[PDB]
Design a protein around this ligand. Structure first.
Ligand SMILES: O=c1[nH]c(=O)c2nc[nH]c2[nH]1
Ligand SMILES: O=c1[nH]c(=O)c2nc[nH]c2[nH]1
Ligand SMILES: O=c1[nH]c(=O)c2nc[nH]c2[nH]1
Ligand SMILES: O=c1[nH]c(=O)c2nc[nH]c2[nH]1
Ligand SMILES: O=c1[nH]c(=O)c2nc[nH]c2[nH]1
Ligand SMILES: O=c1[nH]c(=O)c2nc[nH]c2[nH]1
Lengths: 273, 273, 273, 273, 273, 273
């Protein structure tokens, strides 16, 4: 018995956004949705109307799916995501990603607020993730495989499309701001990491730590949906500074890089258009 | 739907220990309960009478909650804890810690028998943990958050109160025995670690390995209950010696440090009184 | 309430293979079953007839249990195993191993196709595992303990019998092919590892990475069944080469070492006979 | 947590049948769907596309929802229903009925093949049910009440609208065929009734026995949706004749009254138009 | 695994009502709690504080347990009950009754608003039930038996104590009002009965119909707690009159007999004192 | 997903009773197993060894399956049955009956201790049931149908084979004792019926009341296994006498008819041999 939500959604969306085929799908984490406000002919569907979507329970995540145009590019934007720490398993974002795939999207632009594991990169920086290290228990596709979307086994090689990443770099040069690339390691949460664990993440070879990304991305790769991810650093990981960690700190510190983020995105979109 | 056990307990305890407000809550692991025998006006409530408490299934853990005085300090002492390996999830110790919090406790003194990851520290030593590395799958607060006790997100910074740890040090000098501080990393169990995994724990940066602590502590921090933890080393981790590992070895080797432990605790209590 | 499948099987097997007591139990992973074809007076029982056994859902795994003789040695051979990624928990192979134990087996010869974490060892090589690092969430015995088969706590010291491993070495010299020994680290799957994660496995101290072994082995040790494992390398781990990873690549690349494997096994059996 | 399927469907249907508001909703049981073939501008939606709908598992039930016009009357017709004996509880038809309600329907015309408990009425007869006796265990609304659709408690007085029943009578006179009215008693099934039980149904005061109706009707009344039901007798109840009972007998014997049924319906519709 | 709520409650109650042993336990249904207002030295415990108790969801049921004295008789009074139609099974009232038993109660005085099945007895009448006919699916003790409270099998002979019923009669003569005795048959609800079903209840031999009583009483008999029940008729069953059925009608019509009820109870208590 | 226990058992039984095909299957209720003691070459298999069988929890039911010969007739005899009141649903006896069917049995001889609903028939009498009235909630086949054993819908006409019943009559004449035939109505239990309910059973048209039979028989008919049932009356139903009901009374009163029962059975077997 496999979920059929992705299919339902496709029909439900057609009722609100008829004759529309998006190219890029976006996931806007905490306080990053200020982008969805600039979508042309934007139509908003609440997750409550889309079976399978992550009905929000966290701040900085609304619970809407915005469809429209950005830089003359058809786009499906997710204001708010779903996390592992919500207690619904690594599959929380899957049907959602699977919807993007059916909608016709050709790429997933995954954004998220994170912490830095490199003293060199501080709060307010943007990082284009180039690979990840899962620390959450298990993976999204564990269980019976849904032949409809993907295969039993799949490679995560070049998960974070190297080619699209290259365009991200150009866009960054052009806009006068650094775009460092790093390995993202996922933490289950909902509590923050311990200083001890952060050092362990540094030793393991990580550059950025967050509580999401992984679920979505692995699901995306499984159904063969190209991925691109950019984290908005909001502080140094626990123990690398003197700053106290709070969700309030996260939401606030995501405003320093907000402008560069929108330029990076709107720039990327313009080159791919 | 959130558990209400903590609340039930508070009433249940009032029937056995009326007009009593404890300051320090204790968790006595395997063969460490010999301390609860010196509690003044000690009242004992079986876990079977306290909804949510870890009804024992392991040796060295009775299943009682002792309330009374120690060094003229009101105290609630847990003879026996609950583990992940019992198969009930990372939430096994939560309602319990949450009870301590409601009872009015101002600090959790968590004890546990562990293995050493440093050849320098051997069997019979006591270690004041200063941080930890979770290796168990997931965390205690994963799932809907209980606004009543804590917030969705919380910092583990200074989880093992640095100030209380300092007092622990004085007490140790005063009693003529070393109190080394180390990072505790948790293992799921119930099988012991592999030599290979132990080396991995050394590389990750750990000093002590055990099958508990983490669940309790993270729950404690969530509901804002200061923590203090001391492990009683009972052997070197797998592969760092010639000694064979067994639960029988654990219970037995926890008798070498038993006296120093009681002195350390009874000393700590006297300074905080 | 404990599973009784192991017991049922013993009776069910007696109906197909009467008055037969195997000494060595074998687990043949993907495309490794070509060995079971040389079993003398071979009797085949489908897993569908054996309660608890892993009814296959993966390629390279049939779903049969072959009983007979090999080098004049009574043998119970499992064509096809069960994995964590199937979504049934770390206990998926337990009843099976527990059956071997009851059958009277004196040792488990576990085989499996894996990836190499050492550039020195490449595709087509055989590796005798000498220990492992679990990365899957949790362990097989987590939960109530079945006193019938083992104890609550058990040591994984010398899990991969060092003495049997020594015989494996002789057999390898004698047959003119290398038999390197390494630490096997398990990955949950079903997706393959990320380059980033592989490096992390190298740092953690691993030599071979695969999606099985661990479950079986830990279960084996719990009920006190000596273990021996040999992985057939089918490629370098993700990111250590230019080769693309697929299940098709795995099945195909397990044919280069197939002959040496059979000779190693048939040789081992002859020395223990 | 209440089901939201009814809502989803409304959107899903809008995609296939835009700007359409049905007045009468129909439920076509076994071999009664031959009516849905005469629907003007008929649009067909498979239950597989409508969350909550009874995806068929029984013969004589397709799994489609047909929308269109009949006698110039907007109509939503259910080809195939869901039963208790399927093992999903008395709530199996609820979301479906609740969908009719939201769609805007003003009445439910429930049809079903049944057995007669009166020797006077035989195979091929049509019966307009005037009340029912539930024999299935429990009722559809047992559980938390969904304030959205109805109240905690509701009256089943005049469940089978007496006024609409009167029109049914006229239509019957006009078409030259009897339309006897009777009490329908529900049996759980899936096995047929015992002669003994049938006599018990006669004693209890029943006129027609079937394995459905009840669930739908009670759900209908709860969300305040007027009901009308007509059973197509396909044989005498067990023990009142010499005929053997089978599903094959049911499907076949529903062809004797098929023409009168269509005339009765198409006639009813014309008077209400 | 058996529920331990009854035991917890006993301790929880001791905290609010110390050194108190009730003789009669009362269950006050809809709008019948006006009695609990005359309890001497009344102490009120919310069901939210008593594990196992039916936290209300229905009107006319508060969610409190009142303990005190009535006619100088120690009494434990339940303001509000739990029903089957709530969706929690026939066991919904058990732990509650089991609590009464442990508390030391010697009898259960069960009250409830019902419908009359006899035209002779109308709205406002009181009926002392003398036996019952269960129509709800299953029974409270179905499942593993709790040796602590009762036996696997138990007789319902003289369930409604014939001797106590006799005292009820005297009290009724003495107060100048009739107290007819009748058989109570239970209906699952939450919808009201159909006229058809009511006739069926008359044929089956019932005198009063309601949606409760049965669960409580059978539970009581199981743990050997003498029972006494009195229904307050609030209308004729469906189809025996012209009155419309609603919960509003029930609550309102329970005020005509309210005074006689209190006199009957307060009178009964005085004779047993 | 359908149960495969029946199949497992067939193999498990072959190990204990090789080359044996039974003709009659027997179900011995409470204190009726004294028959299984006269089975020739009797082999006994504990239910603990037969997956799906009702591991006993009730007195008068051992938990064994005896296979052998009786009157030179191959026979599979069930010492002890499973009931609804055990809390495992109406399917509790199914796999068992389904095993009889596969074993090759040509008929089920169902016995059980019951109560009489006719004053004419008293304690110690034997009754050949000729039909039944189910009062338990639901039926055994409710749910997905197992095409392997039966069809979705099946007739209960002549459930209690009329022809075999005729032989039962002869055997009874021949042995000088009455064999009255009656309709058996099932009660859920585990509590006994109320006087009120018994009268209701008389009105409904029943002659014997018990807590079993129904589940087994309906399952038998579904997989097309001819049925024969005989109840051993152990008392009058509640309220038709002065005798108190207890399980102790049941076991004891089943000794008056024990001899006639064995003669009736051993006689029946001889005529069918
Ligand atoms: O896992 C995380 N750790 C952090 O420190 C952080 N900061 C923002 N977002 C974060 N996520
Ligand atoms: O996880 C653990 N590993 C050990 O080696 C040990 N010794 C005591 N307690 C221990 N816990
Ligand atoms: O986890 C795994 N990773 C790999 O790269 C591989 N190759 C074969 N088998 C494998 N298992
Ligand atoms: O419950 C039922 N009993 C019958 O005899 C019958 N015939 C058709 N449909 C039927 N349903
Ligand atoms: O089942 C019930 N039916 C009724 O008609 C009624 N009136 C009050 N209470 C009632 N309960
Ligand atoms: O349901 C039952 N009721 C009885 O009175 C009885 N006596 C024996 N067996 C019985 N079963």
């Amino acid at each position: 018995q496999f979920s059929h939500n992705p299919l339902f959604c496709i029909d439900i969306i057609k009722t609100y956004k008829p004759d529309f085929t998006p190219r890029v799908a976006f996931i806007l984490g905490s306080g990053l949705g200020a982008l969805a406000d600039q979508i042309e002919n934007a139509v908003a569907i609440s997750y409550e109307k889309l079976p399978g979507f992550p009905v929000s329970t966290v701040h900085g995540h609304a619970g809407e799916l915005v469809l429209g145009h950005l830089q003359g590019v058809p786009v499906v934007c997710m204001k708010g995501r779903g996390h592992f720490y919500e207690g619904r398993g690594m599959t929380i974002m899957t049907d959602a990603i699977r919807t993007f795939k059916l909608l016709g999207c050709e790429l997933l632009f995954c954004t998220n607020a994170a912490g830095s594991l490199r003293p060199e990169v501080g709060a307010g920086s943007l990082v284009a993730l180039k690979d990840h290290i899962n620390t959450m228990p298990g993976t999204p596709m564990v269980g019976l495989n849904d032949d409809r979307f993907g295969e039993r086994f799949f490679s995560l090689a070049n998960a974070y499309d190297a080619e699209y990443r290259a365009l991200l770099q150009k866009v960054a040069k052009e806009e006068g701001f650094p775009l460092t690339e790093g390995v993202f390691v996922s933490y289950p949460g909902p509590n923050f990491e311990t200083a001890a664990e952060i050092r362990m993440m540094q030793i393991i070879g990580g550059d950025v730590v967050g509580m999401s990304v992984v679920p979505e991305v692995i699901s995306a790769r499984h159904c063969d949906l190209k991925v691109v991810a950019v984290s908005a650093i909001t502080n140094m990981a626990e123990g690398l500074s003197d700053v106290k960690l709070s969700h309030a700190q996260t939401l606030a510190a995501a405003e320093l890089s907000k402008q560069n983020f929108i330029n990076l995105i709107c720039g990327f979109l313009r080159k791919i258009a």
